[PDB]
Every structure is written in C-alpha cells, then in structure tokens.
Design an enzyme around this catalytic site. Structure first.
Site, PDB file in Angstrom:
ATOM      1  CD  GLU A  61       8.999  13.229  -9.382  1.00 41.03           C
ATOM      2  OE1 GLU A  61       9.780  12.357  -8.965  1.00 41.03           O
ATOM      3  OE2 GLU A  61       8.844  14.332  -8.798  1.00 41.03           O
ATOM      4  CD  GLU A  68       7.742  13.739  -5.173  1.00 40.84           C
ATOM      5  OE1 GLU A  68       7.421  12.607  -5.600  1.00 40.84           O
ATOM      6  OE2 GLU A  68       8.930  14.159  -5.192  1.00 40.84           O
TER       7      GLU A  68
END
Lengths: 474, 474
Positions: B374, B166
């Site tokens: 995720e 991320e």
C-alpha cells in the site's frame, strides 16, 4: 530511579602490550610488525617507538600494587604474540609465557580479574615476512595455535578473553590508510585481509569452547555510532549507509556471521568484495561470542556526499583543535562536525549520551551483553611541583560516560564491566606520549624517558571512590 | 546507474473489503464490528458507512475489466471474515466463499495475480460479543479456522497471502485512541490484544506451511520510519526510542518472534506489558514469514520529550494544513514537523526518499524480501467536462515513490511488488469519500450517492504506461 551497577560489575582499566611493556628485545622476544614499522623514518611522531614505552615489563609489580591501591576489579591487557612465538609459528618461548604468568599471578594475588586480549595489533614480523600476515589464510591456524597456547596455559585463571582488538582499525589503518603496518593503501586488499581476520576470530572462539568451556570471550570493536546531521531525507540515508558500512560491516559478522547486503553489493559493484571459500559462512555463523566488546570514545555525524565528493580527510595528529576535515565515501556519506557537542583538542567529539545510544543499539540489534573494554579522555597533563596532576577534565569525561552507562543499564542493556583507557600513561601508536590517558601519570615525554616514575593523578582517587561505592558516588 | 525492475515484479493496486464491497447484509453475510461502529452517530464523517461503499460486490466484473485494461499484474484485496463465517466461529457460508471464488476466477481469467489479505479490521461482531474479539485467546483458533478455510479453497490459485493488515493501526486506533472498534482508550488492554494478535499471526503462518507449502505469506506493517530531528544526542536517543517503540515493537515480533527489550522494560515499569503463557515464545519464533508487507505513506521526525511533556496529540482529519499537534510518549520521544519535506494538507509528510530508507532498514535488520502492499496519495478530485480527472498531483507522488523503489532495488533490497492505494476510489474509514486515492474515479460524494459510475483518471493511463514498460518509463 536508576538501577545499581550489578554486584560483580567489572570496574576495570586497560592497556596494550606494545604501548606499555618496552623490553622489545628481551628474554627471547621476536620482532613484531610494530617494532619494525615504528622505526621507519616518518611513521610516528618525533620517531617515538615501543623499545622502552613506560617499561611495564620490568615494573609490573609496582603497577599492579597501584591497581590494588585503586581497588581495581579487573585489569585488561594484551599478550605480545612475539614474546610467546618469536617467529610467529615455531617453538614456544617459555620466558615469554612466564612473564604473563607472573603478571596474572600478581593480579590474582591482589584480587584483580585479568581480562586477556589475544591480539592488539602486534603480529610477529616473521609471519608478515613469510606470507603477509593477515592477508593470508595461513594466519588462521597460526593465530589459533597461539590462542590455544594461551588458553591451555592460563584458562584456569582467566575467565574473560578478548579476541581481536579493534579489527576495523588495524585492518583499515594497515591496508586502506597505510598509517599502520603493513602501510598499504588498497581497498581490495583491505577487505581480503578483513575477511581472513573474521575467519581467524571465528576459529579461536570455536577453539575457546573446547579449551575454556567456562570462560567468556568476544571481539573488541572500535565503535563510533553514526548520527545523521538532520532530518533531511538525504542525510538520514547517509546515516543508514554510514552505520551499515562502518559498524554493521563488522558487528553483524561478529554477532550473526553475515555481512550486510547493501554494503556487500556496493563493494561487489567496485570489485572490492572479499574472496569467499567453501565453509567460510558455516565457520562464521557458528562462532557466537559471549559479549560484544566495545571501545568507545566518540560519535560521528554524517551528511549526504555526492558521487564526486569527499574521500580521505585530514586527521588531527598534533593536538591543534579545528584542523580535522571531512572524510567519507563518495556517493554514500561524509562526516561533518556535530554542532551540538564539544570536541577535544584532537577534534574527538565528547558525547557521553552517545555511549548510551551505542549500548542501546547493540542490545536492540544483537541482544548481546556488552563489555566496555576501552573508554577514556586523552589530553595534555601538567605535572605540578609536589607531584600533583589535577586532571579535572578527565574526571568530568569519565564521570559523564559512567553516568550514561547506568542509564543504559536502567534501560535494560546488560553491561558486564567498564575498562577505562588507560591505567598508566602509555605510548600512543602515532602521536607520542603527550596525549595522556592514564589514571597514573608516567614521568617521561617524547624526548626523554627520565625516570619513568609513576604519579597518581587526581582521577586516580576519583575512580578509587567510584569503585568503592560500586558507582553510586560519581 | 539503476537496475531495472525484475521481470516478474508485481505491479499492483489494492483495496480493503469494508471499504469497497458494500452488500453489507447480502448472501448471508454477518455483521462486522465496523458495520456496528460506523452506524453509531458521530464516529464517521457525515455518517458515511459501508452499507453500499462503491458497490464492488455487485460491480466486480466491471472493476476487474478496468484492471485488465490497465494491465495490472496483481490486485490486493481483503476477504471479509463475516461473509465466510457470519458468526465468526460457527458454520461456513458457501455464498460468502463463492463471491471470493468468482472474484479470483475473474482475476485469473485476465492474467492478474490475486494477493489475498486475511484480516483488514472487520472481525465479526459476534466474536466481539461472545468474548471481546482480539482480547481473548479464543480468537486465535477461530481466526486459524477462518484462515485454513480460505487456504483449502484458494491455495491452489493464490500464491501471495497477507495475514494481518496494519496490526499496529487497528490495535492502536481500537484500544489506545478509541477511534476504531472497540473504541477503547486503555493501554493495558491495547498490549494484551496486540500480543494475542501476534499469536494469531504466528498460528496461521504455521498452518499456511502445511496447507499451502508452495505459497508465500507475510504480515503487512503500517511503517512510518522514524527520523531524529538533528544530531543533538538527546534527539538521536529519542529516535532510538521511537523506532523501537513504534516499529521494532511489531516488526521484530514478525521477523524474530521477540519483543525489543528496552520497550518491553518500559512497559513493564508501567504495568502495561502483556500476559505471557507457556508456549508463546516458541510459537512466535517458529513463524518466519516469506516477506515483510509494507504499507508506506510518510516518515516521522521526533525529538527529545521530557518526562512531563507531550502525550497524545491532535490529529488533522479536516484537511486544513497546519492543524496537527505533536504527539509522543513522555520521557521517550515526541513528534515534530520535518522542515526539509513538504506535507499534504492533512500534514502527512511527502517523503519518497523515506520509502527507500524504510526498505533499506528492513533488509538491513531482517534480510527479508518486501512486498509494498500500500502506497498512495489522497486528494480531492474534480470531474471536468469530457470525463477528465487531471490528478497530476497523484501521478507526481506515485512517480517519485516508484523511482525511489528502483534505487532501493539497485541498493540490493529485494522488492517483490508494489500495490498502489487504491485501484478505485473507496470509502475512508472515518472521513467519507472526498479524500480520493483511486486510479479510477467513482461517481459519488458525501451527500449525493449518484450512480457510482467508474471514470478513468489521468493517473490510470500513467500507471498503465509504467506497467507496460515495467517501470522503465516513469
């Protein structure tokens, strides 16, 4: 603060040979598939056909002088393959090449850049008779012989070339909707012919790199950018399906040499994916164009279509507003009216912001320069006594689209030029003559050729001023 | 008609080192930026920090046993940089490496695939003190040495690697919103650190090709796919801007090694574009990954945002529904509530079809396989008598996202695996413990640290059944 249009920006106008030339059987020209098809009863509105059209073949000197008065920077036209090869692949008809030579000489003597379209839907009938034209691999080398003939004759004088004009239209209309020759309604054959046309495009771009090393070449795609109706996740998925199936299916092959995978897999599940030969992918991937040609008229909005839902829809052929109905692919998407834009009488959306969106999507996905090879408004015109044609509706459409082109340039899209469709009024393939696109009105209708006289419309003088100011005054 | 999940589909679950490990100062571990940042008063809810977390550094054998009971095919964790190089660039800490060696051996002995994440936001404070961490090109070779250390030690036993987790989050939150270390609100700094993080990603993929030639590696992008609000041309253009600025800005670099041009030109006009050195583009273009990692939670709908309109907006970390406000970029886009999906109480969109859309967009644009690194639902959990946590809300969210994955696989998207977030309850970066994500409840809250005992939630047994039926029973 908008960027200016670049100094050599090609301010243009366009036509297509069958729609403009006439002289359908003169100076040794062979039959094209449109010569034969348009004379079949019921195929065209009021039986209109290209025998005479607006007779540009005999009147090209007058037309070019009008382009010079307008100050056109570029003129996009197509070459009629059946004038050059009357039987498609035999001996060259020198009188056919000599017409385009005279035309190109007229353009260059008036300072106009020619933009030559190799193929605008008029393959010679003899190739259809011999092997079914675009449905056969034989056309790849036949198209290549024709292209190289033009490259060797005219490459010294023509820098900008277009390969296939609106492949998605002539293939889907000829083989899926049966509205164009050969009049077939068969999705399997459609995608086979489409794959062969991809190989033909790639083969002639390859040839172009040998014969015109300093030229610029690209296909001209009929681009309607897709919108989802709203943020409902099922409608955004419909938009993903529609943009891939309708636009990426062609532009990805043009730019990357690869079909998109979700569409391919969906076709494979239906036994519709094309036959691939050894060497096909290598040819397609090695045929990079200099630009993406874009023919733009409207956007299309879509929404979810259940597996039992809408298929073929009603097409507005008449000019009566509000008669079109949804078309789509069951399980994937269907079109729906965009409630946030107006539409012409033929139900085409008026969406100049859509052109900026479309130019932005092409830059963002392919990083290619764009040549806008067609954009225009088709509408009824009234000839008023005094030979006056007040087409403010056309001016307003062209004005707002050119404005959005400049916003797209300011965003960073490399736009090489803009070709308004069309320079003079011309024959529409299926809808006759009343749906006029020209800067120059041609005095005829569906019933009479009258005298075919040319009459400058109000939009003629508007565009003349656009060009004089390089688009600073719209 | 659905395709089954592939036979070797990586059914997984995920964590991040700072969020689960604890042991913040044991066995020679140095301080990370989050060790320092979370101890500053007011940065985190009730001062919760990662000194202990859920104590996975001491209880990993219990944790892997619960994984093996569940039958996880894969477990995704991150390696703490400051356990391996306490100083970032100094001497290696064999005890730090030893913990990850023991963890991998525990996983391998129970037949679990380890997925090692190189970086999850915890750069050693020493590198930040020495030269500003991600704002300096020095971090490129120090991160490479770190990465190469792990490749040499674990390459033989670890096939799947994730580089930067991320990156859009820890760059944006750390340099634009000031919510994460270094707690900066400077867009010029944000894009300079982002460009350097891109070069670090590319350098370690190039090293990985040499040290782990049989392995697979990719970055993991926090992907919120953008939606236009409706078919208003102005809102579709906002969606073009948003998808390119928020998503292509990172994924195009990962896949093609190029920033998108329109976004680049917008930052250039602001004086915000990053500094480029000789060799940058060649490095970025030479680091093709094996997959795109995707952290997915929600989609975002956007609309037109006038040049003076909405800028940075109000986030909802309290959990009271409706308190979020539109954020955006004036001139380009602003967010808006999607009226066709429900939201959590933190105003996050619940949009499992949005995951299929996002998977389809990555395949369509990059043709890359995807590892879903995720996905999860954060919610309060009540421990009821009899060690029962009835988290039917979590099952329902995971079920629908898994169902949409299968449809994307049926569409032709190559999905390598799915790592639910998270395996055990863990410490949130800023809001403490009460918004739980785990299959395994951990006995502690914001005030009382209790005994940290592990308790299987109802969703633990649901996902155990998913794995044993390879997704056929959802």
């Amino acid at each position: 603060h908008l960027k200016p249009f670049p100094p050599e920006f090609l301010w243009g106008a366009a036509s297509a040979a069958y729609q403009v030339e006439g002289a359908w059987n003169e100076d040794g020209k062979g039959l094209s598939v449109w010569d034969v098809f348009a004379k079949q009863p019921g195929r065209t509105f009021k039986g209109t056909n290209g025998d005479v059209a607006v007779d540009h073949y005999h009147r090209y000197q007058e037309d070019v002088a009008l382009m010079a008065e307008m100050g056109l920077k570029a003129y996009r036209f197509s070459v009629s393959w059946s004038r050059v090869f009357p039987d498609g692949n035999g001996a060259v008809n020198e009188k056919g090449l000599d017409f385009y030579d005279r035309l190109i000489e007229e353009l260059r003597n008036h300072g106009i850049e020619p933009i030559v379209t190799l193929y605008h839907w008029d393959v010679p009938q003899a190739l259809m008779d011999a092997y079914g034209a675009w449905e056969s691999r034989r056309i790849i080398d036949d198209f290549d012989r024709y292209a190289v003939t033009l490259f060797q004759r005219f490459g010294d004088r023509v820098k900008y070339w277009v390969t296939l004009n609106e492949q998605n239209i002539f293939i889907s209309f000829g083989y899926r909707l049966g509205l164009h020759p050969p009049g077939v309604k068969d999705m399997k054959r459609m995608y086979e012919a489409n794959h062969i046309a991809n190989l033909a495009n790639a083969k002639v771009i390859q040839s172009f790199r040998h014969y015109v090393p300093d030229g610029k070449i690209g296909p001209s795609f009929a681009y309607s950018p897709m919108y989802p109706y709203d943020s409902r996740p099922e409608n955004v998925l419909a938009f993903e399906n529609a943009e891939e199936f309708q636009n990426h299916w062609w532009m990805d092959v043009y730019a990357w040499g690869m079909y998109p995978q979700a569409a391919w897999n969906y076709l494979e599940s239906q036994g519709l994916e094309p036959t691939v030969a050894p060497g096909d992918w290598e040819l397609l991937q090695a045929a990079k164009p200099d630009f993406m040609g874009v023919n733009y008229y409207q956007t299309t909005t879509v929404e979810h279509n259940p597996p039992d839902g809408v298929g073929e829809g009603v097409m507005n052929t008449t000019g009566k507003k509000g008669t079109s109905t949804s078309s789509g692919i069951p399980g994937l998407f269907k079109t729906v009216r965009n409630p946030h834009v107006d539409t012409t009488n033929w139900d085409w959306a008026i969406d100049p912001v859509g052109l900026r969106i479309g130019l932005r999507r092409i830059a963002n996905r392919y990083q290619l320069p764009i040549l806008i090879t067609e954009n225009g408004l088709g509408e009824f015109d009234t000839l008023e006594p005094g030979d006056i044609v007040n087409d403010d509706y056309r001016i307003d459409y062209l004005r707002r689209h050119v404005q959005e082109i400049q916003r797209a340039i300011t965003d960073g899209v490399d736009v090489l030029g803009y070709c308004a469709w069309s320079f003079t009024d011309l024959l529409s393939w299926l809808n006759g003559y009343q749906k006029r696109y020209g800067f120059v009105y041609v005095n005829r209708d569906d019933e009479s050729e009258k005298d075919l006289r040319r009459i400058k419309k109000k939009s003629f003088y508007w565009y003349q001023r656009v060009i004089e100011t390089n688009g600073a005054e719209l």
